[PDB]
Amino acid sequence: MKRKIIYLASPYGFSQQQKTLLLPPIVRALEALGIEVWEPFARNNQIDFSQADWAYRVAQADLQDVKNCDGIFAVVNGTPPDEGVMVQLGMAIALNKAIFLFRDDFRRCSDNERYPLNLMLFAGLPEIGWENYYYTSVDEIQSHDKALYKWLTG
Amino acid sequence: KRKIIYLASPYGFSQQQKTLLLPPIVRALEALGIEVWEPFARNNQIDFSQADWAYRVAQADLQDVKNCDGIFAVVNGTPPDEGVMVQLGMAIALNKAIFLFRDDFRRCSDNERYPLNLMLFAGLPEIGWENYYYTSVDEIQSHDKALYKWLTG
Amino acid sequence: MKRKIIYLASPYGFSQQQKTLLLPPIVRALEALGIEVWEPFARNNQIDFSQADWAYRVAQADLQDVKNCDGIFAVVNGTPPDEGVMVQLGMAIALNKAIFLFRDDFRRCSDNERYPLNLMLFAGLPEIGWENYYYTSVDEIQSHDKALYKWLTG
Amino acid sequence: MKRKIIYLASPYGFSQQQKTLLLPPIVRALEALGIEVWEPFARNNQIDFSQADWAYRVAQADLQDVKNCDGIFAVVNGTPPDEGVMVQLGMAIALNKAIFLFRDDFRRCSDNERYPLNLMLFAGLPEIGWENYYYTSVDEIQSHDKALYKWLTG
Ligand SMILES: Nc1nc(Cl)nc2c1ncn2[C@@H]1O[C@H](CO)[C@@H](O)[C@@H]1F
Ligand SMILES: Nc1nc(Cl)nc2c1ncn2[C@@H]1O[C@H](CO)[C@@H](O)[C@@H]1F
Ligand SMILES: Nc1nc(Cl)nc2c1ncn2[C@@H]1O[C@H](CO)[C@@H](O)[C@@H]1F
Ligand SMILES: Nc1nc(Cl)nc2c1ncn2[C@@H]1O[C@H](CO)[C@@H](O)[C@@H]1F
Ligand SMILES: [Mg+2]
Ligand SMILES: [Mg+2]
C-alpha cells in the first residue's frame, strides 16, 4: 500500500561521523516498519552550494518536505534540542502531522516535572499517553506497542 | 484595530531576565500601537501547583500563535531557545508575519547568507529578510524596518 | 573582612541588553561586600579590536586574571552554561581558587539527581555543603549564611 | 617506558547510540598511535550508580584523571561544546597538559574572526599554528603533520 512518509529531523548531518554512523541505523529501523523516509541531509545531497541563494533554497525545500510528510520523527537529543529540528517540529504540529520524538540522551533538561524537555515540544502530543510517542532507544522503534507502529496500522 | 504580536522569548526562565529584559521590549512594541501577547504574563494565573500545568501552558501557547497576527521571536543565545523555535515554526506554517530579534553579537550558523540556522529564515523573503531582523531594542520602533511598515499596510 | 579579588565570569557581555541590564546588578552586589571585582568584558574594553590578534590577546588576559584572582564567581545560567565560563571555571578549580556559582535560571538541566547541572561544575566544591556556594538570586549574594560572605572574613 | 596517556573528553556517553558507535572509532584512532586512552564513561562504569553520592565520586575521579593524564583530546562538537568537556579542558590548560581539540561539526559558532569557537577554548594553544592542534575528522587524527603525532615522537 502507499507507504507512509516520515520526515526524519535530526542534527546528525552536521557532524561527519554522526551523519555516517548514527543516521543509517535510524533510517533502517524506520524502513523496517514499511515507512518512506525523507531524510533532509540525504535529500539535499546535490545542492549547488556554489550559489549564494543555496541556503534559502535548502530552507524552502525543507519547508516543502515538512508540509508534505505524513509524520515527523524528530531526533531531539542534545541540550538543548537542535533549533532547526525545533522549527521543523513546530511546523509539523501546526499542520496536524503525526508527531514522534526520539531522545536516547539520558540528561533531563526542563522547567517542569511532567516532561523531560521544554513543554512546547509536546504541544502536538496528547495530554495522557504522550510517552507512547516518545522513543528512548533505536531498538524501541520497532515496538508494536508504541505509537509509530499503531499509526501505520490504522 | 491593533494587530496582535506574540512575543516569544526565553526571558521568563530567569527572574532577573523577566523583570529587566522583557518590559523594555514590551514597551517598544506597544509604542507602535501593537497589542502584545507575552506568554509568561498571559499564563501568570495558571495553577502551577497542578501536575498538568505544563500541558495547559503548551496548549495556551499553541492557541496564542494560532490567533496572533505575527510573532516577535527573541532568538538570542547559542543556540536559540527550543520553545521559541517550536513557536516560530508554528508561526511560519500558519502564514503569520514573522519578525526576529537578536542583539547577541556571536554568529552561530551553518551558512554564510544568514547569521543563524537557515530554517529560522524559511518564513521570510529571499531578498530583504534583514528588514525583519532587529539587533537592538531601540531599533524596534524604526520607521524603515518591517514592523512599522506591517502596521501601516 | 578582606578585600578579595573575584573574577566575575559570565556570558552577559554577548548581548547588548544583558551587558547593560543584567551584569551591573551582580557587579554591585559583589562590590557591596567589599570585593574587588574583575569583570572581563569591562577589563578588556581597552583592547584593540581593529587588528586580527585581539582574540588571542583577550584569551590570554582572561587566563591571567583567573591565575591571579582569589576566587571565581561563575554565572552558569543558560542551557547549557556558557563554554567560556566553563573553561574558566575549570582553570579556577585546577588552580585551587575559591569557587562560587550563580544560577537564577529556573530550568534544571543535568545528568544526575544530586546536582542541578552537569556534575563537573561542582568538582571543586565540597561533597557536603556545596549548596552554600551556589547562589540562585542576586539578593542572596550578600547573605552572611552563605560561603562568599564567610570566605571574606576567613 | 610508560605510554603517553590521553584523556578522551566527550559528551558521547550521554547518548546510548553515540556512546556505542562514535567513541570506539576514536579510541582506536588514538590507540593506533601507541596512546593509552582514558575514556571517562568507560573508566567510571564500575561505580555504584544506585547510590546518591555517585555524582560526586565521578566528578572527583574525572578531576583526578585530568590531573594524571599527559594530554587531553577534547571532543568539542555541538553548539555550544559540552559544558563538562569545557570544565575538563579548562583544568587541562591550567595544569599545563598537552591540549588537542576535535570538531568534525561543520557549523561555525563564535564571537571572533580568528577561531571557529569561543576564544577561551584556544587559550592553551599557541597564537600561531593552533590549527595544528585542531582536528576536523577522525581520519586526520593519525596525520604525521599534526600536533598529536609530533608530540608523541618528541
Ligand atoms: N545546512 C543544512 N542542510 C540541510 Cl541538508 N538541512 C539543514 C541545514 N540546516 C538546517 N537543516 C534542517 O534543519 C535540521 C537541522 O538543523 C534538519 O532536520 C534539516 F537538515
Ligand atoms: N514554562 C513556560 N511557561 C510559559 Cl508561559 N511559556 C513557556 C514555558 N516554557 C516554554 N514556553 C514557551 O516557549 C518559549 C520559551 O521556551 C516562550 O515563548 C513560551 F513561553
Ligand atoms: N570576546 C570576548 N571578550 C571577553 Cl573580554 N571575554 C571573553 C570573550 N569571549 C569569551 N570570553 C570569556 O569567557 C567567558 C565568556 O564565554 C567570560 O567569562 C569571559 F568573558
Ligand atoms: N555522568 C558522567 N559520568 C562521567 Cl564518567 N563523566 C561525566 C559525567 N558527566 C560529565 N562528565 C565529564 O564531563 C564530560 C561530559 O560532560 C566528559 O569529559 C566527562 F565524562
Ligand atoms: Mg504497495
Ligand atoms: Mg513488527
Residue numbers in the entry:
A (entry chain B), C (entry chain C), D (entry chain A): 1 to 154
B (entry chain D): 2 to 154
What is written in the article reporting this PDB entry?
Here, we characterize the structure and function of a thermophilic dNDT, the protein from Chroococcidiopsis thermalis (CtNDT). The reaction catalyzed by dNDT proceeds via a ping-pong mechanism, with the formation of a 2′-deoxyribosyl-enzyme intermediate covalently linked to an active-site glutamate.13 Transglycosylation occurs in a stereospecific manner, preserving the anomeric carbon in the β configuration in the newly formed 2′-deoxyribonucleoside.
By homology, E88 acts as a nucleophile, forming a glycosidic bond with the donor substrate. Any residual activity is unexpected given the crucial role proposed for E88 and might indicate that another residue in the active site vicinity can play a compensatory role in lieu of E88. E88Q and D62 are 3.3 Å apart, and therefore, Y7 can interact with either or both residues depending on the state in the reaction coordinate to ensure optimal positioning. Interactions with the nucleobase are mediated by hydrogen-bonding interactions with D111 and D62, and the 5′-OH is within the hydrogen-bonding distance of N118 (2.9 Å). The rate of 2′-deoxyribosylation was not significantly altered in E88Q-CtNDT compared with the WT enzyme, in agreement with covalent intermediate formation not being rate-limiting for kcat.
